[PDB]
Amino acid sequence: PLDLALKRKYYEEVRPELIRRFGYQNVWEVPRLEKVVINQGLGEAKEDARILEKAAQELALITGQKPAVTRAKKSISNFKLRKGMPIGLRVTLRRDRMWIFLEKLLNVALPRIRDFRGLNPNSFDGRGNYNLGLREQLIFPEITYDMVDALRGMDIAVVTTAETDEEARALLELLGFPFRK
RNA sequence: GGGCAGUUUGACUGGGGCGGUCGCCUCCUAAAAGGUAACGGAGGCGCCCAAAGGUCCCCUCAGGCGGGACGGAAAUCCGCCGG
């Protein structure tokens, strides 16, 4: 389904707002979202491979995309890990399904958070990408109450043709991100 | 069944005994071919794998810095440098 608000938001709204703000010279040099990665630090489900399926299928309806995993390379002896075996969920979303995830983020995910305050502005990686943490993934639409067996956490990532955080800062505000000033 | 009989009871070894060692692999000693000794200096082997093998295809690390709900000295993830 190639169409949505954020599909056009970036275009008939953000496209020229940037050309004014920074003034490019070519249609491509303009900062674009193009890669949303979603991650999970599930060292917890080290034991239960069952709870592995839940964070995965939940991820399915929230990310609107099939989920994937990744076991470690040199695993922490101390915290119950050793070699190739463990677990760390990961699911890169691109094209349009990326958008349809984002629309749920700044218009549903954020507005109903336990005392959400604003996306920490320091979260820019010096270059043009963003990373931010969430505790409850039940703030997502499809997730019902009597269904979650535990508060599994995770953290999202969004890659941008941005070359500096200023340029990224502007490009996320313009698409619609509730920054903590 | 030492009453009795025949015998056995290793070598190296700055004397012999005691100690240590005894075959195989790696490095040094070794003097830029090879090979070289010492009771010279140091470490391993007496296995393991049906996937840890064949071939086809695909991808490429460790680490350093920056960023990320548990966790950051080191899980998993995005980025950039990284032969």
Ligand SMILES: [Mg+2]
């Ligand atoms: Mg030119």
Ligand SMILES: [Mg+2]
């Ligand atoms: Mg005789």
Ligand SMILES: [Mg+2]
């Ligand atoms: Mg003798």
Ligand SMILES: [Mg+2]
């Ligand atoms: Mg002697």
Ligand SMILES: [Mg+2]
């Ligand atoms: Mg002896």
Ligand SMILES: [Mg+2]
């Ligand atoms: Mg030599």
Ligand SMILES: [Mg+2]
């Ligand atoms: Mg020689």
Ligand SMILES: [Mg+2]
């Ligand atoms: Mg010869």
Ligand SMILES: [Mg+2]
């Ligand atoms: Mg000779």
Ligand SMILES: [Mg+2]
């Ligand atoms: Mg394997």
Ligand SMILES: [Mg+2]
């Ligand atoms: Mg293997």
Ligand SMILES: [Mg+2]
């Ligand atoms: Mg760090």
